[PDB]
Amino acid sequence: VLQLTIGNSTITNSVVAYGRWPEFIQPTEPDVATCRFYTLDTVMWGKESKGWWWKLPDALRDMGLFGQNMYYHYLGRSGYTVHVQCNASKFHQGALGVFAIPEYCLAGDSDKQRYTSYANANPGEKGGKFYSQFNRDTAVTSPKREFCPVDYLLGCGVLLGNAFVYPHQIINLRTNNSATIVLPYVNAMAIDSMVKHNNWGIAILPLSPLDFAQESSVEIPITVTIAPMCSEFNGLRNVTAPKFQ
Amino acid sequence: GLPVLNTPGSNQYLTSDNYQSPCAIPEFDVTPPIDIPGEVKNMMELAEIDTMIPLNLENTKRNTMDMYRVTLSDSADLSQPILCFSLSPASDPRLSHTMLGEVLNYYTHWAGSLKFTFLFCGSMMATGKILVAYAPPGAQPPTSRKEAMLGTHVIWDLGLQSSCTMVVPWISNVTYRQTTQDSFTEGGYISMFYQTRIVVPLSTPKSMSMLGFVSACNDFSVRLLRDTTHISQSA
Amino acid sequence: GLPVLNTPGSNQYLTSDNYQSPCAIPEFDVTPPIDIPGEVKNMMELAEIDTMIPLNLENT
Amino acid sequence: GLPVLNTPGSNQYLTSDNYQSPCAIPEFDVTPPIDIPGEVKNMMELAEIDTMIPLNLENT
Amino acid sequence: QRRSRSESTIESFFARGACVAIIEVDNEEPAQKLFAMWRITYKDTVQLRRKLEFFTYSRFDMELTFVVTANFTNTNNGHALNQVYQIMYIPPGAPTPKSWDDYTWQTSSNPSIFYTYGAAPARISVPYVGLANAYSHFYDGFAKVPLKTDANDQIGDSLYSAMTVDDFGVLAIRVVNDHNPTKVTSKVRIYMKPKHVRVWCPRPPRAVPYYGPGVDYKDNLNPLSEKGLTTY
Amino acid sequence: QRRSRSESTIESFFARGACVAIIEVDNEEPAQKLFAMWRITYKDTVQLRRKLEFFTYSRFDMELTFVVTANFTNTNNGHALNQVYQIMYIPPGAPTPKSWDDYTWQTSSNPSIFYTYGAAPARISVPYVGLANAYSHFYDGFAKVPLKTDANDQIGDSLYSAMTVDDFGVLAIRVVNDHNPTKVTSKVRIYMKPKHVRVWCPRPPRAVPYYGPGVDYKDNLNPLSEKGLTTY
Ligand SMILES: CCCCCCCCCCCCC/C=C/[C@H](O)[C@H](N)CO
């Protein structure tokens, strides 16, 4: 609706998660190097798309100096401002539910429990995608150790309809083309490791299927832009180099 | 020492009692709390949160993402209703598994006004009027617009506002209703009809989907905690 | 702790006793009362009411 | 006498409890203490004392 | 006036504990009664029922006392260790046990009493849990009305003077102990004591034996005995 | 506004004692279960687990109640004297028993409860013993990160959503009494009651059966039942 300027990045309803604005608690605080909007890779919303999911701060691990501070320091905390952009014409119809889940633990694909690997559990800016059904992994010799989120189960054994208990925003193409959620730092500790722990999960679900006129196939872009807010790090040491394979 | 008389009930363990007990780890320096966002002080706070309704529970649509979508169309039969469900926020299949219903299924009694928010997710070039009606119990469940008209109702213009809030006020013979199917504490019915139609121009989808959300109002209250039937464990 | 002596009668259930007992449903919001006509405070109030007598109790 | 209700946990021995117990030697004139050097009031006082580290733990 | 009416008060009239149910629970090798579900009401017995039906409406806080009596059944020299009985309250809507070791016995939110045999009878108190502003001993009506548009007569068919099918739930009583090699049979007697009683609309007492949960009468409809008209 | 929400409060919602574990302890001539070690958690049962997982973070003081039920096992006329059960808490790091008569049972610094059979269930209270400022029902992360310089993938391999292997320790339960000539089998049921509960970040309730200590789901993934769109 109005100008949204952070650092050196400006974006032309916005919901504050849990009514709490990001806030600070000698932590290293880059007021400019990290407090800015980083744009994730655009995804394509089609008529056969089940959904998308990203993990924060994992999605910003390779975003400018924020990732460098995240890997160099031991433990850091950061709020976020997520902005989802999806522009469509008056003749397009659809709705996206954008949910910011605290501790968005997801279910695996194998009978073995909690067997998902770090590489698969931390996809980065590409994120992942939900599925209509639960596909059980059958590669016993070389298990994929990847999540198997289910659209209507939200990937966590709960019903999608109740996901609105989480902070949420609905992009309904007939009325609005963008959503904005301001997430504070949510954790059981005032500050925690970012490389191993993800504080937030952004799930975008097509509540209503996309459609345009009488066209058989229609696809429109969705772009996610995340701004770290009041991010502070502590425990400076040699750089961490996670094995992503 | 002091003469005492052991009253009946002694040496019993009531799981709902509130008695002081010895501490197994005395002089423990518990970690102090912090101001974590999202503190909840009451369970009815969760019920007040609107959550989507599985309005459509057909055999080929339930337990999917299609169970939350109700199809509207310009070719629909304007005489027949769009959707119909009883006002049972804990036993009705469409409301039982909602967050409100989930909280209610932990209690035996409930009392308060409900709030149903219907969101139209069609094109901005689609317009129409929808009659959303609540009928208190006692009479025939409205099978026609001429009947649902007679009960409480609201007209919702799709073009102007994409969301409509139908508030169902608390009207009950009893002070509390049961969270279980009971014809004596029956709550009423909710129905939807086409007031005029859905009108769309050319090069526009002629079929659209609407979503439903249910929430509790500030007057809502529950009573007599119990065990939910939704979760089971193999023994 | 406090030395006590168990007096005779302990562990007995007298159906006419008046002892406090634990509540099985704590923090229950009981429905408030209304002014229903015909409240009775004593059983002798019923006895004071005149009622017809079966004076004739022949076999037929 | 005084009506009482035995709560759960009665007749249990918790090794970490703090309950008063009868004295087996009443009216005992305990020897008074003296100011012995090196009184310790906390166990962390011992931890604050520097002590040598077995840094080298090779087999030989 | 020096003679008082302290004992004729409503509170004093109901200040006695009346047995309302006897429940049989057996422990044996697992057609069986390892767990017994009893629906809560005072109409299984006549005395307290008759006392309460002196009035039309009531409002009272209840006090329940459980007396458990165990015995052997054809034991030769088979013996058992002291048993613990679980009495779980299941209000309407909550899941009901299908076996003596079902998950429902976890009592996560259903109140339960664990009573050790040989101890004092287990006593608890319940407040006024009525949906309405007072209990209705007599309900001159139905819960469903048969309408002209009903497909079949059974849709609106309801029992006369029946308000709710599940009035206040049930009590499920089991023996928590595993089965000893010898059978042990126990009877739990529930004694109900109204307290803080308030009553409205006095009614004449029942004159003929009760027949069911209603005012129905079937037999022994000639209560008064023979007596001469002019015989003192 | 006269109807209150006293029973919907978080404290009232968890004010019931939920069974979280059943432990079998046998006394017999010393492949055997003379002592049983149970890791402390509420995830062995679903009811309290589901109630707690309504939220993301919690902070509560716990109350544990132990109900012990003993029975004979194929006894002919072999009998036993009243038994005493030792329940010893072993926090992470402390030595664990390797036998029923090990030195670790001395309980020099590990708290322990000695419960005499036939008495009241043994109840104690625990404060908030969390390392962090609140308990984490859901942990979206690992405890180890696999690094490029790691010699093998197993160095950094860790379970997803697992914080610590030894969360809060175990309870070791034994029968202090020596073996009677006849076997005696006992079940200890542990009931956990949160108190002074504070919760943060509400979550939707579980809709499908739990499968393990995590959010994993395997079966019965079709909860909602069939119902007509326009059927009341
Ligand atoms: C293990 C804990 C036991 C908890 C027991 C709670 C049971 C609740 C029942 C309360 C009222 C039962 C009796 C009073 C109602 C009368 O029948 C009324 N006249 C109803 O017609």
Ligand SMILES: CCCCCCCCCCCCC/C=C/[C@H](O)[C@H](N)CO
């Ligand atoms: C004989 C004395 C017994 C002493 C028992 C002390 C055990 C300490 C355990 C305290 C906390 C256990 C349960 C609460 C923690 C929850 O599982 C959290 N959500 C952890 O994820």
